[PDB]
């Protein structure tokens, strides 16, 4: 039950006729799935690893100029020549300097001048690319059983880790005692790694767009150059200075590491040491619960006394988790657990750790339940020695609805057109929504690519104004809606 | 001649001696002895507990 | 039972070890070594020089 204690936990409720549910996993986020007769499970994408990265381009961020040579021509004789001028490891520039009798020419005019310095790279940033077939996502499936940690077991927790690769994208987790779960994942859509570069600078790495990386203004090698003697775009990292038209000097343009760090703002940082681990991905899977079963359903209710060994606490998600221990005769037994009113004549809350059972007597089991908004009483055990605990939930139903709508809108903003697959069970409405969102997201990405959030807000305000002052009601409402949507996206973007 | 230095700017730094302190929720902010010293760059944030 | 201290507020204080540093006009800002210790309270102002 790892998904408690994380603020991004999200609840998927229900499966389809086929016993499957579509869930989108994310690295920061966590998913808790609850089905009628299936146990509650916690799914988290922990590791995304890109393997066998190939370098496509090396950029120079700190250059050096060493052997400066110059050649001068007298006026009306054209441009001079240097043999270093057609050497590719030399950066050269042609200019004009005043010439005359003092200079040694004999004619009065502009004399051509050329200066060359050898370009040497002292530090570079490797932009690597990974084939989409080499992504290996790692997921952990932990059955939300309530069992505590076991030292003797080879696996201390009963969470099972399953690796999903693009070729072997179908895998089943065998949760001991709970049957098995099958993940039908789609790695090829999680991230488009044919438009991404794994940009590793000195000791740090980022996941960046590939056209952005190919359009950087720095000297670059093609990536297969071991010698590094043919830098391209060398003039972006040097400056040629000709003041007063008397001399010409060329100097290096300074370590560009800080400028690159400033240019990397808005790029997610990813580890690129001891493997290419990305902790920013999302993965879409189809969860099949048909072979997943509740543990201990053929047990009898416990008749003994329970003591709380860990005081009831409220998680960030509006549920409560308590830890109880058993002092009764029936070794394995179902724990009687209800959330009722003060008079115990109505059931107000629903359990999250479905089928809490007590496998071993001297082994506490911790139960997550969702009490109702307001006052409620957690009853644990049967009448002789029964323990009744009060609790107050400080929210409101309208508040929770607003928070849920905000969370849905936020996931739409993050996983645009893929949020429809976060809790979908099939269905016509889900497919229609996903198709319309795909079309509109294509249009939005076309019309808002490479634009900052302030520009997004400005455009949203302009569009909303245009809609507000519109003669036609249909266009007015459509434009006002577009403006509101782009205002929200600009507010929520760049995180 | 004889220009007097007006302001020194840092163009390349290095961070070291990193340290962290945490508090449980609703218990205010943690305290690091290094916060007293002004050559330590410090920041306060909240993490899920 | 067993309350946890959330914050601590100062009602009575005292000042000691007062030091000052001055800079000639147009030459920037004065510098004090104690300005780097956060238990020292400091203020920058301009005087006629």
């Amino acid at each position, epitope marked *: 039950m790892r998904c408690i204690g994380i603020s991004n936990r999200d609840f998927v409720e229900g499966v389809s006729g086929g016993s499957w549910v579509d869930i989108v996993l994310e690295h920061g986020s966590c998913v808790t799935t609850m089905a009628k007769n299936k146990p509650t499970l916690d799914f*988290e994408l*922990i*590791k995304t690893e890109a393997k066998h990265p190939a370098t496509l381009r090396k950029y120079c961020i700190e250059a050096k100029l060493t052997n400066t040579t110059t050649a001068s021509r007298c006026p009306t004789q054209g441009e001079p020549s240097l043999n270093e001028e057609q050497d590719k490891r030399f950066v050269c520039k042609h200019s004009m300097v005043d010439r005359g009798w003092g200079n040694g020419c004999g004619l009065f005019g502009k004399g051509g001048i050329v200066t060359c310095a050898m370009f040497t790279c002292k530090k570079n940033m490797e932009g690597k690319i990974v084939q989409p077939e080499n992504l290996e996502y790692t997921i*952990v499936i932990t059955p939300h059983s309530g069992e*505590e*940690n*076991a*030292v*003797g*077991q080879d696996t*201390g927790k009963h969470g099972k880790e399953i690796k999903v690769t693009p070729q072997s994208s179908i895998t089943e987790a065998e949760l001991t005692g709970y049957g098995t779960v099958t993940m039908e994942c789609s790695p090829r859509t999680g991230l488009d790694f044919n438009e991404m570069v794994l940009l590793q600078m000195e000791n740090k790495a980022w996941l960046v767009h590939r056209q952005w990386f190919l359009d950087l203004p720095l000297p670059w090698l093609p990536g297969a150059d071991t010698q590094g003697s043919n830098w391209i775009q060398k003039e972006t990292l040097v400056t040629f200075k000709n003041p007063h038209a008397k001399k010409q000097d060329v100097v290096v343009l300074g370590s560009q590491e800080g400028a690159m760090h400033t240019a990397l703002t808005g790029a997610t940082e990813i580890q690129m*040491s*001891s493997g290419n*681990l990305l*902790f920013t991905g999302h993965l879409k899977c189809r969860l099949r619960m048909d072979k997943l079963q509740l543990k201990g359903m053929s047990y009898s209710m416990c008749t003994g006394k329970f003591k709380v*060994v*860990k005081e009831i606490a409220e998680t960030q998600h509006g549920t409560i988790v308590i830890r109880v221990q058993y002092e009764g005769d029936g070794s394995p037994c179902k724990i009687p657990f209800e959330i009722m009113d003060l008079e115990k004549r109505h059931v107000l809350g629903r359990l999250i750790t479905v089928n809490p059972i007590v496998t071993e007597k*001297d082994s*506490p089991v911790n139960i997550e339940a969702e009490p109702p908004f307001g006052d409620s009483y957690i009853i644990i055990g049967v009448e002789p020695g029964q323990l009744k605990l009060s609790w107050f939930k400080k929210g409101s139903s309208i508040g929770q609805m607003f928070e849920t709508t905000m969370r849905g809108a936020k996931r739409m903003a993050i996983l645009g057109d893929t949020a429809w697959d976060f809790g979908s069970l099939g269905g016509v409405f889900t497919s229609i929504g996903k198709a319309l969102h795909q079309v509109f997201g294509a249009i939005y990405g076309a019309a808002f690519s490479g634009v900052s959030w302030t520009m997004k807000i400005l455009i949203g305000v302009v569009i909303t104004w245009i809609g507000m002052n519109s003669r036609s009601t249909s266009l007015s409402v459509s434009l006002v809606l577009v403006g509101v949507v782009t205002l929200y996206l600009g507010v929520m973007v760049q995180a | 001649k004889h220009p007097a230095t007006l302001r020194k700017y840092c163009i390349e730094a290095k961070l070291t001696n990193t*340290t*962290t*302190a*945490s*508090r*449980c929720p609703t*218990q205010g902010e*943690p305290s*690091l002895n290094e916060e007293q010293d002004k050559r330590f760059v410090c920041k306060h944030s909240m993490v899920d507990r | *039972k*067993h309350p*946890a*201290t959330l914050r601590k507020y100062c009602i009575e204080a005292k000042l000691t070890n007062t030091t000052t540093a001055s800079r000639c006009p147009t030459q920037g800002e004065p510098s004090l070594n104690e300005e780097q210790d956060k238990r020292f309270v400091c203020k920058h102002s301009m005087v006629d020089r």
Partner: antibody
Amino acid sequence: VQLVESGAEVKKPGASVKVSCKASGYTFTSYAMHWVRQAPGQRLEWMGWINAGNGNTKYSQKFQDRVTITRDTSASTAYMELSSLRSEDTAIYYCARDKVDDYGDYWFPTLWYFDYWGQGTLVTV
Amino acid sequence: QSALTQPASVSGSPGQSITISCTGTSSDVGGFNYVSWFQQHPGKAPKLMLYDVTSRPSGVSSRFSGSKSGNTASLTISGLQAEDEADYYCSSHTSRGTWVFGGGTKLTVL
């Protein structure tokens, strides 16, 4: 899961003694390796931990300038190096483990930290 | 973040219940649930008896119970068999990311 250290070492004061703990039975890279000393007849004393996943470390202030902790991923061995030894450093040195988080960062421990120790190493001076 | 305080010695006749106190500060023991009790027999490495204040490892008897009140955490042994005679060390993960061990206590049992 067994943690094995080196044999007892005798050092003259002012010398440097390096001890080691060999982690078997579990993924070495996924666990953080702590060093705890205990003077004969004194209490235990935490020295520091090495995050074998990426080599990160944290030493107790009492040993920050003297104790050095290093790892050998392939050898699955952790090293405890305490230079500038003194009379007071005569004590049995233990090695205890602690799993690092899913991302190898290791800044929050696990509630069951120091679950498995080593038999300890005796250093005398 | 200094050494936790425990009584030097504790004794109890077999079959009695024996309690050990570990007193820390708002960061050592009163701030976090990183309270673990270690049992060390002479000439041997410490054994993790309790953790998370109350929890005990899989192989640890049920006679060991832990409680924490304010800045003080207590360890209680019920059966108090002869094999329970050992040095009991308390530890806690302090707010600064370090580990502090209590002075330790000894059970004489007889």
